[PDB]
Amino acid sequence: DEEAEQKLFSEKRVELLKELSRKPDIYERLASALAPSIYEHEDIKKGILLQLFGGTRKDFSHTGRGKFRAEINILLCGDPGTSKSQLLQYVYNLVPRGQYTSGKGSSAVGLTAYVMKDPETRQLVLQTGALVLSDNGICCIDEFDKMNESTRSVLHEVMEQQTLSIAKAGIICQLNARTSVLAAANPIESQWNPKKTTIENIQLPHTLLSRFDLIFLLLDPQDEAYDRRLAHHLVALYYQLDMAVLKDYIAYAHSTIMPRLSEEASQALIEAYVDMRKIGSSRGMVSAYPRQLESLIRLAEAHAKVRLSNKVEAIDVEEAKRLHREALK
């Protein structure tokens, strides 16, 4: 509601934002200020920071293609105790217009749209679920594994086309939303056994793993150094950057930025997809379909918005390619 209110920024503040956006690492300096209670986990905060900006909002009404999703869906898989649900509980309390759901306490129609016998007029009327009430924000879905395959095949529409087509007793309509899932699951057997293949610990289909574009595998064992550093950090919470910089940097970077691709960036995006195929084909980890080539765009542009660059260049593809590669390892 405060896009007209962005023009209501002190010009003393736009200087601050534009100058903070010039330091060589403003990316790692803002990211590392998310949730100052999680331990390092350096990449997951990068992904969850790029998710708060999202790719450009291009206008494809002319090409008859339809619309184009601009928000980023993130999946977190990894063995227990690795602080997944804490990240969801932190984001849900950060973003406005969000929801938090669970595995068994949510049904197929409760997430998208149900039809209720209105009490007074005795007529069937439509209502909105959880994935539509968010609509501008994040829909944290914890316990992603423990949802029977019925209620899981519902996300296929709302998370890829940003739409929802309902055809029931008297209601024939077509909603739409601008949500962005952030899901968390456990491997099958709840224990990451390295005997099996990556496409077997997750046990999700391919028509659902491809709608995500950042599958973070929190592969964390009993590293005697990591455990010691984490415990040393956690105990400290018992003795005893700002927000309004981030809380305003985000509003600005939403209001007055629209990164358009280049020709030098576009020429690193073609090979970055022709190699992904040969890589993901053999290993049996997670194949790559052309949809990923759009995700890179989604990621690349979303990186440019961090530094207010208004134009996508080469490095904004190498970064959001290293991010896409070094998450599954």
């Binding site: 291009k58 090409t63 008859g64 080539l293």
Partner: protein
């Protein structure tokens, strides 16, 4: 003692009566004296005055209409009962209605505050329900009871209103009058409900709705599922049970579609060849005479899809349609062809469906996991107001004579794939339920997309083992396009180039001949022929059916979904749909040869290690 001159109303009535006669069109020839001509034959009682012309002829008036439209409506209709006495054949107690149109400025259902009541607005929305038509009493003629006189011309206001004073000094019943009902004045009255259009919804909100009240010859213009554009006045309505509580209601006077595909005014080759504007008709002819047309509709309909040249052709032949025939006994041959796609992940399946559903008019789009049986075909709903079970139309019905795009066709339940087969077979929809017995028509063509069992398409089995559709359904399609993503490094460059181009050229990378508006015209024209078969073409067809069966012959090879008779009745259909395309009126060998090559590439050979 005598009544008061409502001057602001009568002065406006006078100026409007003047405007009706003085205003002329481009060639003299006063225009509201010829549109008001047909206004005498029975069943016509609304004159449609454009509002922009009332702006030309006058401007001290438009600002009186657009600000008092409820005060001065009962006078802009009497000033039409005098202007039309020059015909002398109208029944003297008949009454007429003025219906404006083409207002300058629009509004939204959320801008309809309470500072707008009594003014003249304009609204756009969808249509959800439509109640039945009724009579409504506008001015009763109370036959007095004791005097046996007639109290006359008493106006009702949302109630019966029982006027209680007589002009007779001896009226024993100032509380009793039996009104007649063979002289009083009735008008039709339909009450529908509209819902906020899609492009106005503020994000994260459920759409509002309001009641509109069509009250004239305009009484069945709006139907359910349409996107009309109403123009009337907002009024308040009491709660007549206690006659308080008020509620807003829109009182429409004119209703017209929101975006006419043909801006003239809103069924054979000549009726349409009349409305063709000069450029329209000199372009349709040019296309119909074009050679290689069958390759410039594909390249111009799907401009951003590299390859699958054998799928675009099938989709086109599905859009044009075959010839629907009715056997003399009473049965009927299916006229339109159905098409299913089956392929590897990310092979542009949902892209064909999205293209078709955004191009075509009156074509609906549904997924499979989020549908129902009683939502596709037809439902039964208890309207407690009428306290009766009535029929609701489904996706296979409000897409009639169009195309129904079903995505993920094999996710639907076991019992929801049964109701769809009962419709795909007989082209009808039976209903037998609480108190309802009916048979509805459904002449849709289905375009369905599915996924092989276990992700990938295994090329060593028949079809029946690669997909989980039923057995009957797989027989009612008669065109399959199995797609296989044999990861080719040369494509993975082409697709990459095309996608990055489209994303660097937002609105460009779509330059093609025969712009999309034009193809709709050509397709509405060329879909009104009924090509016939010449004897040589019939001989060719039977020979091709001979040469198709024996390929499936024993010994040498093997194929999937064995060829049967139904493939033959589906070769004449493709040839007829091919002939329609070239605007001809007969089938030739040139068509059947190609309609056979296509159906030949459709079926693949099972393999074995």
């Amino acid at each position: 003692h005598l009544e008061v001159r409502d001057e602001v109303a009568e002065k406006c009535q006078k100026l409007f009566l003047d405007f009706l006669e003085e205003f002329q069109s481009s060639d003299g020839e006063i225009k509201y004296l010829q549109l008001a001509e047909e206004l005498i034959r029975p069943e016509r009682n609304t004159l449609v005055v454009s509002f922009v012309d009332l702006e030309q002829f006058n401007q001290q008036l438009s600002t009186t209409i657009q600000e008092e439209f409820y005060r001065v409506y009962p006078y802009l209709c009497r000033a039409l009962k005098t202007f039309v006495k020059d015909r002398k054949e109208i029944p003297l107690a008949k009454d007429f209605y003025v219906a404006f149109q083409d207002l300058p400025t629009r509004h939204k259902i959320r801008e309809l505050t309470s500072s707008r009541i009594g003014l003249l607005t304009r609204i756009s929305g969808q249509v959800v329900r439509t109640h039945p038509v009724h009579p409504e009493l506008v001015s009763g003629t109370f036959l007095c009871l004791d005097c046996q006189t007639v109290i006359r011309d008493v106006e009702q206001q949302f109630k019966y209103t029982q006027p209680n004073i007589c002009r007779n000094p001896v009226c024993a019943n100032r509380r009793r009058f039996l009104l007649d009902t063979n002289k009083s004045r009735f008008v039709d009255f339909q009450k529908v409900r509209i819902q906020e259009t899609q492009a106005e919804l503020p994000r994260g909100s459920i759409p509002r709705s309001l009641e509109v009240i069509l009250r004239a010859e305009a009484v069945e213009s709006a139907q359910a599922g349409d996107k009309c554009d109403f123009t009337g006045t907002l009024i308040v309505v009491p709660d007549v049970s206690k006659l308080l509580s008020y509620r807003l209601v829109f009182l429409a006077c004119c209703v017209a579609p929101t975006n006419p595909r043909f801006g003239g005014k809103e069924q054979t080759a000549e009726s349409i060849k009349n409305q063709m504007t000069v450029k329209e008709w000199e372009k349709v002819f040019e296309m119909s005479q074009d050679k290689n047309l069958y390759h410039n509709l594909c390249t111009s309909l799907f401009p951003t899809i590299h390859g699958n040249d054998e799928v675009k052709r099938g989709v086109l032949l599905m859009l044009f349609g075959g010839v629907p025939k009715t056997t003399g006994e009473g049965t009927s041959l299916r006229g339109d062809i159905n098409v299913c796609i089956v392929g590897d992940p990310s092979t542009a399946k949902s892209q064909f469906l999205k293209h078709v559903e955004e191009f075509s008019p009156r074509a609906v789009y549904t997924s499979g996991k989020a549908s129902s049986a009683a939502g596709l075909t037809a439902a039964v709903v208890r309207d407690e107001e009428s306290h009766e079970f009535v029929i609701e139309a489904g996706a296979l019905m409000l897409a009639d004579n169009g195309v129904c795009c079903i995505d993920e066709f094999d996710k639907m339940d076991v019992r929801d794939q049964v109701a769809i087969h009962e419709a795909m077979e007989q082209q009808t929809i039976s209903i037998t339920k609480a108190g309802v017995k009916a048979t509805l028509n459904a002449r849709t063509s289905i375009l369905a997309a599915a996924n092989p069992i276990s992700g990938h398409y295994d090329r060593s089995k028949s079809l029946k083992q690669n997909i989980n559709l039923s057995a009957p359904i797989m027989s009612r399609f008669d065109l399959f396009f199995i797609l296989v993503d044999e990861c080719n490094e040369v494509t993975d460059y082409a697709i990459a180039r095309r996608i990055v181009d489209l994303h660097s050229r937002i609105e460009e990378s779509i330059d093609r001949v025969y712009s999309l508006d034009d193809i709709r015209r050509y397709l509405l024209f060329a879909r009104q022929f009924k090509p016939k078969i010449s004897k040589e073409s019939e001989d060719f067809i039977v020979e091709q059916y001979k040469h198709l069966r024996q390929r499936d012959g024993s010994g040498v090879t093997k194929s999937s979904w064995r060829i049967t008779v139904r493939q033959l009745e589906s070769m004449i259909r493709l040839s007829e749909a091919m002939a329609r395309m070239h605007c001809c009126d007969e089938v030739q060998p040139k068509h059947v040869k190609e309609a056979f090559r296509l159906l030949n590439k459709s079926i693949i050979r099972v393999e074995t290690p």
